[PDB]
Symmetry: C3
Subunit: 76 residues, 3 copies
Amino acid sequence: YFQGTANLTTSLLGDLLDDVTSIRHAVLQNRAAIDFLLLAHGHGCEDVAGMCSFNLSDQSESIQKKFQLMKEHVNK
Amino acid sequence: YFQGTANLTTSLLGDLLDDVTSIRHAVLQNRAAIDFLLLAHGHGCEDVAGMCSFNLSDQSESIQKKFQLMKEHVNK
Amino acid sequence: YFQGTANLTTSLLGDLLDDVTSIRHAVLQNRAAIDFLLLAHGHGCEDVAGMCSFNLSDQSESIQKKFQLMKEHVNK
Ligand SMILES: [Cl-]
């Protein structure tokens, strides 16, 4: 049914949001590690494109609320 | 039609799953590279937040099967 | 309505595509940083699994056009 397709979509998006959140966290831990290494070479994060930045696209707020709204709409 | 919207959604999700899988793999290769560098400074991965961990959110199993179920449901 | 579910889905996918694009960019900047460090140890990217590669799964073209087609179809 349409409820079928819809519920599959939200289930799937749920899993995918959680994997992407997890990916982002790892990338930022990786960047922090990199900056410690640059430090130990006597270099600052400014010596490497992007390495000072820890404010990635983080539309996490927006996505969680829309996801909730979608579920509540799709499964009620 | 609804089949239209649905088939666009699964096509798109297909591409996105493949890009996210690929991203995760790269992040884990990046972390492995980092740990080799920490090693060469005489440090262990325990000296850097997260650097020992290679078990990221990996709901890949779950997502592939739901994706398959969605396609088969959406396009049959 | 179905337009409801649909418009929520595209809004959400929009945010997610933008976050994933942003993630990928960061991972590639992280890899570039890593390679500079390997260099400073007298090693080439060939000494570390994946570190030479900057051509990640990048189905960005395909996804943007399908996303556009989906919106135009879903919200018209
Ligand atoms: Cl990374």
